[PDB]
Paper text:
Here, we identify and characterize a novel toxin domain in Pantoea ananatis that displays remarkable structural and functional conservation with the human enzyme CD38. This bacterial toxin, fused to a type VI secretion system (T6SS) PAAR domain, harbors a C-terminal ADP-ribosyl cyclase (ARC) domain that hydrolyzes NAD+ and NADP+in vitro and in vivo, leading to growth inhibition in both bacterial and eukaryotic cells. We show that this bacterial toxin, designated ARCtox, shares the catalytic residues, enzymatic activity, and overall fold of CD38, yet functions as a cytotoxic effector capable of depleting NAD+ and NADP+ in both bacteria and eukaryotic target cells, suggesting a dual role in microbial competition and host interaction. We demonstrate that the C-terminal extension of a specialized PAAR protein from P. ananatis, PANA_2924, acts as a potent cytotoxic effector, exhibiting both antibacterial and anti-eukaryotic activity through depletion of the cellular NAD+/NADP+ pool.
Crystallization of the PANA_2924 extension was, however, achieved after dissociating the immunity protein from the complex by adding urea to the affinity chromatography washing buffer, followed by refolding and SEC purification of the isolated toxin. An X-ray diffraction dataset was collected, and the structure was solved by molecular replacement using the AlphaFold3 model, followed by refinement to a resolution of 1.6 Å. PANA_2924 crystallized in the space group P212121, with two molecules per asymmetric unit. These two molecules adopt similar conformations. However, while the first chain could be modeled from residues 252 to 385, missing a flexible loop from 311 to 317, the second chain could be modeled from residues 250 to 385, missing a different flexible loop (amino acids 345–349). The structure reveals a globular fold with two lobes, consisting of a four-stranded β-sheet covered by a helical cap composed of five α-helices. A search for structural homologues using DALI showed that the PANA_2924 C-terminal extension displays a fold similar to the human protein CD38 (Z-score: 8.6). Although the overall identity of the PANA_2924-C and CD38 domains retrieved using DALI is relatively low (26.3%), the two domains are indeed structurally similar. Indeed, substitution of any of the ARCtox putative catalytic residues, W273, E299, W323, and E356, by alanines abolished ARCtox activity in E. coli. Upon incubation with ARCtox, NAD+ and NADP+ were converted into nicotinamide and ADP-ribose.
Author numbering: 252 to 310, 318 to 385
């Protein structure tokens, strides 16, 4: 592996009701920077903003991101928000790594999606 997962994991923990996820684009609008803007404008964080703001060094590159994404998902609690576009990439981390671990996270109480362009919301899970 390209990273030292065991020492990074504690830094991926998030405050309750603060974690955001994201995937895809709608009419070409989306991606990690748009998700971070939506998240921070609403008082929350993303995986990328956590990595940047907690100064975690990230690049085998795909495996590193999968491991950190899974750890981030495992450590959230409360209400979760996800900026999910209409156009998703086959194999994306949100559907293949993160959302299954959110479903397996007994502390997740709600998942709400937000479109990256319109910001229309949909509740997709209530536990």
């Amino acid at each position: 592996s390209l990273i030292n997962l065991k020492e990074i994991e504690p830094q991926l923990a998030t405050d309750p009701d603060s974690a955001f996820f994201w995937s895809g684009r709608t009419e070409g609008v989306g991606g990690p920077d748009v998700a971070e803007a939506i998240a921070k404008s609403r008082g929350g964080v993303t995986l990328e903003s956590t990595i940047k703001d907690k100064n975690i060094k990230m690049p085998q590159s795909i495996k590193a991101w999968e491991d950190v994404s899974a750890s981030y998902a495992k450590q959230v609690s409360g209400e979760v928000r996800a900026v999910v576009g209409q156009s998703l990439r086959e194999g994306n981390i949100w559907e293949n790594v993160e959302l299954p671990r959110l479903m397996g996270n007994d502390n997740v109480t709600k998942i709400t999606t937000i479109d990256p362009l319109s910001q229309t919301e949909k509740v997709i899970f209530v536990r």
